[PDB]
Design a protein around this ligand. Sequence first.
Ligand SMILES: NC(=O)c1ccc[n+]([C@@H]2O[C@H](COP(=O)([O-])OP(=O)(O)OC[C@H]3O[C@@H](n4cnc5c(N)ncnc54)[C@H](OP(=O)(O)O)[C@@H]3O)[C@@H](O)[C@H]2O)c1
Lengths: 324, 301
Amino acid sequence: ARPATVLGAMEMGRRMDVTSSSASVRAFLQRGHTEIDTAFVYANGQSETILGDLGLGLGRSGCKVKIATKAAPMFGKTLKPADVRFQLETSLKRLQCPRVDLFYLHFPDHGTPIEETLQACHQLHQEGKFVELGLSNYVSWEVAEICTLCKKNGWIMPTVYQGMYNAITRQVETELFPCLRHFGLRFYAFNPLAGGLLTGRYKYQDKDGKNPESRFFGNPFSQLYMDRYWKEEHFNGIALVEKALKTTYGPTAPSMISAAVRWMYHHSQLKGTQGDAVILGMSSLEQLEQNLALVEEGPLEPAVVDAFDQAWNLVAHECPNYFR
Amino acid sequence: ARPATVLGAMEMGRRMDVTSSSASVRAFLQRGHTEIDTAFVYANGQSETILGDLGLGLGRSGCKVKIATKAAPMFGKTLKPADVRFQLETSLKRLQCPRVDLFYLHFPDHGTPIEETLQACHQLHQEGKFVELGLSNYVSWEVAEICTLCKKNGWIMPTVYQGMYNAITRQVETELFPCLRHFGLRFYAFNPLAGGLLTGRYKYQYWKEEHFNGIALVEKALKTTYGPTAPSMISAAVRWMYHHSQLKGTQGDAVILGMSSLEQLEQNLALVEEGPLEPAVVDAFDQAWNLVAHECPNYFR
Ligand SMILES: NC(=O)c1ccc[n+]([C@@H]2O[C@H](COP(=O)([O-])OP(=O)(O)OC[C@H]3O[C@@H](n4cnc5c(N)ncnc54)[C@H](OP(=O)(O)O)[C@@H]3O)[C@@H](O)[C@H]2O)c1
């Protein structure tokens, strides 16, 4: 079976107003999907707030919708016990819910010993504030340390890892994926479109011109994205794929975005039977509706799959790290 | 200081006879180096056997030679406790020594739970059979699980990792090396010449076109920089390991020098003592690495 689809709620309350956010949730649920991904930091708290007002009854026995949130060592907070508790308790209030289904450590706090953070997570779990524990942006060997500590201490083990993965960003495959398989974590991929770079709407020289509001220009985290993906090699690879699309399908070929999405669902190492999933991103209802349709499309012809491999090969030596 | 040099003894009893092996040890020790690396499996057991017969007094107080060996899931053996013990006890007999300075798990036994193997390694260390524990060919995350188990259980922690690393084989830098620094393991690099590719003796006529293109870039930089007094390709590759890699002599990191002959060893011992390379040549090695990073062999199994 194909990977699951998770709704990324990062723009809810930022570029997306309440109306469009609500519409997006409805569209996503109508497609049969159930999991929504937000975070304490998203839209400075508005993503969670918007979601918690939809009258969905999050965290209550009988909710078919599953909610994930995250605690982050940012905005002046760390992953010390008190700060982890502060974030989760705040998220529960914003989400108007008694427990979240999945609670992540958003990214590492290298200034707080991990066992301290984990002990806090275990206590919060024992209080009934979350069902499953997740990690994001931890290196493979940190995941293994965490799982070993949890096992030895009798603490809830993480069962989900959320990481950066797309057709031209595959660092996770080598060391992380086998670790996750070993310890029993399912993988949820973010940046499936490389923040929009894999839609093909950009050109390298673009950064040297004025650009409309987007992930790469005008976003609070645009610099992070330029450093991550704005490299000549990423652009040359996309170019190979666009060429193979035409050569194989002709002017009726699937679009670059269609290709990139289908790669995630049909040609990646993600496995539906392992519970793996793709987190869709969007900055408008229109984009989401488009993407939701693309998820249902089928596999690509081999020549195009080969082109994506070629593109990955071109950029591998400068792939952004999946860990921080 | 520069990284240390460790004698790789795998060919003692295979491509190298007793006479050459003995001479090789003398040449290595004459240069001031001290650590010798062997394994239960090397040369059908003859590597340890030959080393044991050299009269070095291994494992004893005042010995100036340090010896390493390894246990592997080979020859019908696994890394189950009884089999780890069996291999070390055999090695001690063959090496004619009461202990070894470093005992490795040679490569993973995915069929034996690692905590079972580790407990046996602890027991053997408590009997005084080895000083330090090492790992080889384990993936970074396995190293972390091992260290975490050892710390929680109060068992000897691994302090050495031996793995593949050379100027065009750098996968270990990304995930392995930070893990090793975190948990306190030094790193011993093997295959510093990438199977001979980095000697420049092979040409396109598994290594692909981009590999030979890489070597060409380095050769071109060497000629542009130094002209008629350029280091050879083999010299440059060795100098990269000792002067321009992420190995740190103050962390106890080292390079394993392999040999299939006394002559090859004497040549390589001389290269170790050569100096740094100019930046343009180092840049070329980086460019060569960038050409083949996407198809780097895994350092683990
Ligand atoms: N754990 C983490 O560290 C982390 C980090 C990143 C995201 N995530 C989660 O993953 C979710 C998805 O990740 P992501 O948002 O980066 O996904 P993505 O699909 O790689 O990037 C989404 C962006 O691509 C563009 N895009 C998407 N669909 C499009 C379409 N149909 N047509 C044209 N452009 C389109 C839009 O860019 P423009 O805005 O420029 O229009 C959109 O904002 C987020 O909402 C969040 O929940 C987690």
